[PDB]
Amino acid sequence: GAVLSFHNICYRVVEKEILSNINGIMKPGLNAILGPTGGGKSSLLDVLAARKDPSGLSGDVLINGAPRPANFKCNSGYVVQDDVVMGTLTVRENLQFSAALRLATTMTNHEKNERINRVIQELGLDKVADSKVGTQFIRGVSGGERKRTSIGMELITDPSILFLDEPTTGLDSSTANAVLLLLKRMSKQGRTIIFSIHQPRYSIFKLFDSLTLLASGRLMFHGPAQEALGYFESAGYHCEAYNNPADFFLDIINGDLIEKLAEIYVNSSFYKETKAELHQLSGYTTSFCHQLRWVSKRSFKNLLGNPQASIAQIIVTVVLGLVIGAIYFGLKNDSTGIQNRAGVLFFLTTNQCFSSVSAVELFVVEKKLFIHEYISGYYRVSSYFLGKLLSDLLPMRMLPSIIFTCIVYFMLGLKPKADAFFVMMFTLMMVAYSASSMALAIAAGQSVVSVATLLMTICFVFMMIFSGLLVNLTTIASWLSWLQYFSIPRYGFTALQHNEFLGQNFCPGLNATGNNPCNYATCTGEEYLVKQGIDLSPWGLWKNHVALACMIVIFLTIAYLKLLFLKKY
């Protein structure tokens, strides 16, 4: 099988050392890593799996007599403590996704289906193959079945070496025993299993083949688990009956010293033998389009399977549209036309902007899953970005603009032409895309959602002040005027005003005989636009969409560069 031999490890993580001097050999079977919570057990596991940065590593990890290959992460499985499976998807769907992106595309779909069937049969999930996994807060298969599902996702590719972080934490005692019996059955086949656990039971402990006890980043013991109790008893720490030996081992460390125990081990017979053995030993699959298609498919299934959020936004949009159509019904070309028109346009623009602060959750929620799957070799950092946008961003943001315009444009009696209807729709869509893109840029590469939401809201109100309606931008002083070019709402609102007010007359029965509206009237739409600082040329309408497009590109590029330089280790 495989023999993962680590020798003289020292990891320095501010320069702290969480693993000091750890050497051992993990032969095939069911190997273990025990110790207190603060001990470097998960850290050692990651070090052996190469899921940790090589910066601090100061030792030689050597598998089956040769240095670790570059494709080790891809050829070896790793199971997370908290399952990352997609609740909205069916078990077989998740297994199909993993098979699609990990296994070679040369394999035909029939062969992959056979492989998935084999794995499902082995884990014993055949009954619940076609059932939704569930969020573990939402209803679905049981927690043990979710854990089995994760194990299967990693088992698709026939891994020789398999790592497991806390396989039994949060599971019930019966479920935990079931999981570990399953792992023992897997190990009898020759697959080397390496895992870390917390507070095991003697029924569990009786199944181990090797034991690695860690405390405060030091090696208290490495050897067969059966002989560990004899070793400690020989050291003088006698054990009482009806006491789980694992608890006794932890108790010795707790003191109910550490360097003394480490030296005792160094003088053991299990250390010189291990030294002799170690001295003897020492001296992308898939194309870009495939990744994009599958990640987009998974995202769309997640969107449909959990429709509570999207449906609510659609409902709110429709209700607001029907209310606004009734309130502003029958806009008139009289003294009060200007106020109502400007007000409705302002409201639509700001509603499109402030409703886009819900895009911060697009990447924040799925951060751990993204990191795990990138390290495991599922996909590139580009395909994830493009697919997630194409699935979760384009349609949701493209809908509200269409709904609003179709509902309100003819109830309100706005311009009766077709050239203007689609300009309005396009303008609103671009505003929404730009605002959502700015949200992604700020919120990308973060795990906390609160701060990003606060920042987004503050920035948007500051932008909204510098829109035309509230301040008359021609009045603002020079040393603060330039801030208006950094406003998303300004461009959209200006475009809508240019589209609507060009041609209207708001003076009933002027008769223009004296030709004098008293110069303080605002009798015509063009006069209002010029007094507001807007340009009546056609370029004045499109120099706003140009800016919105450029802002979209800039923000999306920033978000990509933030995901690409994120720390994934």
Ligand X SMILES: Nc1ncnc2c1ncn2[C@@H]1O[C@H](COP(=O)(O)OP(=O)(O)OP(=O)(O)O)[C@@H](O)[C@H]1O
Ligand Y SMILES: CC(C)CCC[C@@H](C)[C@H]1CC[C@H]2[C@@H]3CC=C4C[C@@H](O)CC[C@]4(C)[C@H]3CC[C@]12C
Annotated binding site for ATP: 35-42, 139-145, 166, 198
Closer residue to ligand Y, CB minimum distance, 319 or 546? 546
Closer residue to a second copy, CB minimum distance, 402 or 512? 512
Residue 42 in contact with ligand TTC, rule: CB under 6 A:
no
Return the C-alpha torsion angle 86, 91, 92, 98, nearest 10.
Answer: 40
List 543, 545, 562, 568, residue binding ligand Y (CB under 6 A): 543
The alpha carbon of residue 114 and the mean position of all alpha carbons in its chain are separated, in whole angstroms, by 31
> To which H or E segment does residue 61 belong?
strand 60-63
8 A C-beta contact, residue 214 and residue 33 = yes
CB 117, min distance to ligand TTC, A:
46
Question: Which residues pair with residue 78 across a beta bridge?
Answer: 163
Question: Which residues pair with residue 159 across a beta bridge?
Answer: none
Contact set with a second copy (CB under 8 A): 36-37, 172-174, 177, 199, 201-203, 239-245, 247, 250-251, 254-256, 316, 323-324, 326-329, 332, 335-336, 339-340, 343-344, 346-347, 351, 458, 461-462, 465-466, 469-472, 474-477, 480, 506-507, 510, 516-518, 520-523, 531
Residue 467 in contact with ligand TTC, rule: CB under 6 A:
no
Q: In the chain, how long is the greatest CA-to-CA distance?
A: 117
Query: Which of a second copy, ligand X, ligand Y, none does residue 546 bind (CB under 5 to 8 Å by kind)?
Result: ligand Y
Residue ranges of the annotated binding site are 35-42, 139-145, 166, 198
Residue 464 in contact with ligand TTC, rule: CB under 6 A:
yes
- What SS3 state is found at 210? strand
List 2, 488, 547, 552, residue binding ligand Y (CB under 6 A): 547
Contact set with ligand X (CB under 6 A): 13, 18, 37-43, 81, 165-166, 196
| Residues 353, 357, 362: CA angle, nearest 5 degrees | 130
Query: Which of ligand TTC, a second copy, ligand Y, none does residue 475 bind (CB under 5 to 8 Å by kind)?
Result: a second copy
Report the 3 state secondary structure along 276-322.
HHHHHHHCCCCCHHHHHHHHHHHHHHHHHHCCHHHHHHHHHHHHHHH
Report the 3 state secondary structure along 438-467.
HHHHHHCCCCCCHHHHHHHHHHHHHHHHCC
Residue 550 in contact with ligand Y, rule: CB under 6 A:
yes
> To which H or E segment does residue 212 belong?
strand 211-215
Q: Could you give the CA distance from residue 554 to residue 33 in angstroms, rounded to a whole number?
A: 47
Side by side, which strands form the sheet with 17-26? 17-26, 4-12, 60-63, 66-67
Residue 457 in contact with ligand TTC, rule: CB under 6 A:
yes
CB 71, min distance to ligand X, A:
25
Residue 338 in contact with ligand Y, rule: CB under 6 A:
no
Backbone phi and psi for residue 158, each to the nearest 5 degrees, phi listed first: 60, 60
Segment contacting ligand Y by CB under 6 A, of 59-67, 70-78, 306-314, 542-550: 542-550
Task: For the segment 338-377, give every residue that binds ligand TTC (CB under 6 A).
Answer: 347, 350-351, 354-355, 357-358
List 461, 530, 549, 550, residue binding ligand TTC (CB under 6 A): 461
At 177, list the tokens: 């025993």
Return residues touching ligand Y (CB under 6 A): 485-486, 543, 546-547, 550-551, 554
